[PDB]
Ligand binder design. Sequence first.
Ligand code: NAG
Ligand code: NAG
Ligand code: NAG
Ligand code: NAG
Ligand code: NAG
Ligand code: NAG
Lengths: 114, 114, 233, 233
Amino acid sequence: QLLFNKTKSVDFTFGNDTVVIPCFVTNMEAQNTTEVYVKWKFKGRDIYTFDGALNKSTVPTDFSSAKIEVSQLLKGDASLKMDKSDAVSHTGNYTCEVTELTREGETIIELKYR
Amino acid sequence: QLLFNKTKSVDFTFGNDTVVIPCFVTNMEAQNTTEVYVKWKFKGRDIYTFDGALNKSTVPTDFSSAKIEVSQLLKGDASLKMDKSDAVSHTGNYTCEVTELTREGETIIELKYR
Amino acid sequence: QVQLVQSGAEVKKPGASVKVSCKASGYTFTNYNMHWVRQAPGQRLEWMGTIYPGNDDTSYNQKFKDRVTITADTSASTAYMELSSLRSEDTAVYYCARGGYRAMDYWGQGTLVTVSSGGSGGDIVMTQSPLSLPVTPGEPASISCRSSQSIVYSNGNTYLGWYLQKPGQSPQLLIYKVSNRFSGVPDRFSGSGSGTDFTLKISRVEAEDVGVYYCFQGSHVPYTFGQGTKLEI
Amino acid sequence: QVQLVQSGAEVKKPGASVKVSCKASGYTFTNYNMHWVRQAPGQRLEWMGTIYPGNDDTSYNQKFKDRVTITADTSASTAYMELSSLRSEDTAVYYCARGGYRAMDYWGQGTLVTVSSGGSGGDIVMTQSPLSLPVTPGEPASISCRSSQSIVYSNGNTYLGWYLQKPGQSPQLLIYKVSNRFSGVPDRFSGSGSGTDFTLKISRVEAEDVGVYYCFQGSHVPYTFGQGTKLEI
Ligand SMILES: *[C@@H]1O[C@H](CO)[C@@H](O)[C@H](O)[C@H]1NC(C)=O
Ligand SMILES: *[C@@H]1O[C@H](CO)[C@@H](O)[C@H](O)[C@H]1NC(C)=O
Ligand SMILES: *[C@@H]1O[C@H](CO)[C@@H](O)[C@H](O)[C@H]1NC(C)=O
Ligand SMILES: *[C@@H]1O[C@H](CO)[C@@H](O)[C@H](O)[C@H]1NC(C)=O
Ligand SMILES: *[C@@H]1O[C@H](CO)[C@@H](O)[C@H](O)[C@H]1NC(C)=O
Ligand SMILES: *[C@@H]1O[C@H](CO)[C@@H](O)[C@H](O)[C@H]1NC(C)=O
C-alpha cells in the first residue's frame, strides 16, 4: 500500500560526481526508522539494503559507494546515492523496494547515460 | 428412469361396468413382483397403493373398488380398474406412480365423461 | 487507536446473499488494505480476498469467484464483503482485517453468518450417531440418522438410503426408501424411521460387515450424505 | 452382471481440467440414471450430479456450478464427468454410480484425482506440529510450520506470518515476514526459518498466551493458514 511518485528514468553525465536515483513514498506514516526496510535491486540482485530495525546497511563489492539518507526515510525519501564509477558500471533498471511494518511497495527507475 | 407409454385422457360412459385407467411402463425389467411398488394418486391423495414386497393393496373408503392386476405388473401393466360408481364420483386427473427398486416414474391420465 | 467494527450477525436462507460491513477508525483508510477471512465452526481460518481502497484494486480467492464482491467506501472508512448464493458450507464467522498486500495486523470482532433451512440449494444436515460402533459377532447393532428437514418428498415418498463402504472397497447400497432392502442384502439389515428420524439395525453382526455406514437423502437437491459410522470388532 | 468401470487415476496441476469416464455393462444403459459422487480423503461422500442418458437430462450440485459437465454416450454405454479449474480441495476419489433418480445402487471402482502444485490457484499446504501443546508457565514452547512449497516470493521476501487467536477473541498478529515482531508483542515471541520450514519460539510461556496459533503464507494466492496449534496449561 506504499504509493510512489513514479519517475520513468533519470539521466546522468560524467560531470555528476554523485548520482541520485529518486524514490519517494507519498503515504509513508512511520514515526521511527526502526519500522522501515529499504532494498534497492539492480537487475534482480539486492545492491543496497537498509535494515531499519538493526540500523545497518549492506552493499556488494561493485556497489561500495551505494548509500541512502536515512534521516529522509520518514519523509518518504529512499533515494539511492552513488558515485560516478558505480553509476557508469551499473546502467539499467533499478527497483526501489520500501517496507514499513506490514505495508510495502516498490517502483522502478531506469538509470540512463546521456 | 421408468418410461411410460403416455395417454392424455380416457373417456367413459355409464355403460362401462368396469372403468380402466391405462398405465404402461416400457422399460420394466423386474422378474418378481416383490421389487415393484405402485401408487395411484387422484387430486393429490393416494387412492390406491400396491406394496409388492408385502403383497398387499390399500384403498380409501370412497375408492372401495379400485384394483390393479398384479399378474400384469412384470410386463409393465399397472392400469387401474374400478366400477362405474367410483368413476362417476371421481372425474379428473389421476397420477400413476410405479417404483421398481431404485427406479421410479410417474404419468398423468385424465378421466373424462363423454 | 486502531479499531475495526463489523456489522451484526446475520441468519440467512440458502441461495441468499449477505453483505458484511467493516467500519475502520483510528488510521488513514486510503493507505491500507482490507482482508476478509472466514472461519467455519471447528475449522481453520480461510482467506477470501482483499481490496486496496486507494484504487479499489482487488485480489480474490478463486474458491469464491463470482460469489464474493469486496467493495470499499473511502469517505465512510468502511469496507464491505458480499457473499451471494449461500450454501451450508458458508456458515462461518467472517472477519475483516487491516493489513498490507500480504499480511493482516488488526482484525475486526467477526460476524456470524448462519445458513438456515427452507431455501433452495441448501444442505439437509444428515447427522449420524454414533461415529464409532464396536461390537462382537452375533451381538446386534444400531445406527441412527437424523436430518435437519423432512426427507418427505412432494409425492409422499421418503428417499433415505443407507450405504456401506467396506474398507478398501467402493460403497454399496443397503436400504432404499427408508426401509426397503436391496437385492443381495441379507435379512439382518433393517431400515426404519419417518420424518427426520431414521435408524439402521443389524440383528447379527458378522465379520464381513466391518466398514463405514452412510445415510443419504435424495429428496432435496443437493443430495447429502451423513458423517459416517465406523463399524469394527 | 452389472459392472461399472472407470478410467485410471489422474494427476493434474491446479487450474487444469479432468475428464473421468465410466464404462457401463451388464444392463440397459438408457433406462438408468448415472450419478457422480466424490470423496475427499478422510471426509464424507459428496454428490456432484446425475444424468439420464435417454435424453441427456442433467441435474447438478450448485457447489460445482460452471465447473462440472456430466455427459453420456449411449452407444458406448459410457458416462463422463469433467471438472475444470481444479483447486487443491478437488483432490478426491471420483465415483460413478448407476441408479434411479433419487438413489444409487451399483458403483464404480472410483477414480483418484490428485491436484498437485506448479499451477495457478493451488493451495500451499501449511502443516503445523504439534496440534496440541500442553506446557507449564515459564517453560519454553516451540511451534513448527511446514509449507508444501517455498514461501519465497519473486522479490526474494518470505511473507510467512504467525497469528494468535486467544479463546473468545479475534486473531492478532505476532510475527510477519518470518522473523519480524509486530508492535506490541513481547520479546518472548520469536520466529525463524526459511524456504519451507519455520518455527515460532516462545521463550517463557505465560497464562496470557493460551490460544490457537496459526501460521500463514501471503506469497501465493490463495493465501493459506495452518491447521492450528492449541496451546494450553
Ligand atoms: C546529474 O546532474 C544534473 C545536473 O546537476 C541533474 O539534473 C541530474 O538529475 C543528475 N543525475 C543524477 C542521476 O543524479
Ligand atoms: C525508535 O525506537 C527505538 C526502540 O524501539 C528507540 O530506542 C528510539 O529512541 C526510537 N527513536 C526515536 C527517535 O526516539
Ligand atoms: C527498463 O524497463 C523499461 C520498462 O519496463 C523497459 O522499457 C526498458 O527496456 C528497460 N531497460 C533495460 C535496460 O532493460
Ligand atoms: C368403456 O368401454 C368401452 C367399450 O368397451 C371402451 O372402448 C372404453 O375404453 C371404456 N372406458 C374406460 C375408461 O375403460
Ligand atoms: C419373489 O421373492 C420372494 C421373496 O423371497 C420369493 O419367496 C418368491 O418365490 C419370489 N418369486 C419368484 C417368482 O421368484
Ligand atoms: C388435467 O391436467 C391437464 C394438464 O395437466 C389439463 O389440461 C386438464 O384440464 C386437467 N383436468 C382437470 C379435470 O383438471
